Paper text:
The starting point of this study is the solid state structure of a complex between human carbonic anhydrase II (HCAII) and a helically folded tetradecaamide aromatic foldamer with a nanomolar HCAII ligand appended at the N terminus of the helix. In this complex, the foldamer is achiral but its handedness is biased by diastereoselective interaction with the protein. Computational analysis of the HCAII surface and inspection of the initial solid state structure led to the suggestion of main chain and side chain modifications of the foldamer helix that would result in an extension of the foldamer protein interface as well as in absolute helix handedness control. Although the changes implemented have not resulted in significant changes in the dissociation constant of the complexes, the results further validate the concept that AOF helices can serve as reliable scaffolds to display biogenic-like side chains at the surface of a protein.
Author numbering: 4 to 260
Write the structure that this text describes.
Amino acid sequence: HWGYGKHNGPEHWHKDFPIAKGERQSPVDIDTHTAKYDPSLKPLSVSYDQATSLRILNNGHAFNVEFDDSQDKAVLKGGPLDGTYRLIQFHFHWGSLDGQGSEHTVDKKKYAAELHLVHWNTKYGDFGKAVQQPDGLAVLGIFLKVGSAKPGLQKVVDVLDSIKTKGKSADFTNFDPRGLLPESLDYWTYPGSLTTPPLLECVTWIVLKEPISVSSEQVLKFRKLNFNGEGEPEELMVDNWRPAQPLKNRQIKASFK
Ligand SMILES: [Zn+2]
């Protein structure tokens, strides 16, 4: 039932998901002047050479590229994390307008879009057990700005016409998520939550400082997707982002001096 519209959108999620007013909700604004360098953060390790994408799907809120997480084929390690986190899916949030779209902000600056690579902690049995624990998920967040085209994104963009509406899916093999990374993996990290219902506070957030650059042509294809199912009145899939939430007692740690 929840969405991003006037009445089912983020400002009303708390009616059905009371955790929405919890102590470590995401996203948050990253105040660069308050986020301290932490020299105990170990280097961020990403092992994606054996990543096995399976399918792409429009679930009515975003589109998800799903991966085989049955073994350590595509794992995140290091940084603030203890243990091994398996990539399960990635998706985007974007705006109707280049000036908005990102979930996290940096000194209140909004980016045009935000990519989330979602991983879960093999400490737990599976995704379902991991989401129920404060140390269960690690989400790598990567800002998008409008500029030159992102070649590693073109394979995703080139299949969006086949998943225009909610419920549609398609096979989507051999996608290399490495092609979505920026040059620097300098990042900020803090403990937080899912940014969509059920909004569980199970996420170690790792937000990269350097955005990737995508083309107008590429984001205009994002904005052509539909929230609605085929045959229902069109609602364009745009502004599917949750705004910054209160930071409360939390500190953002920076990985760079
Ligand atoms: Zn997300």
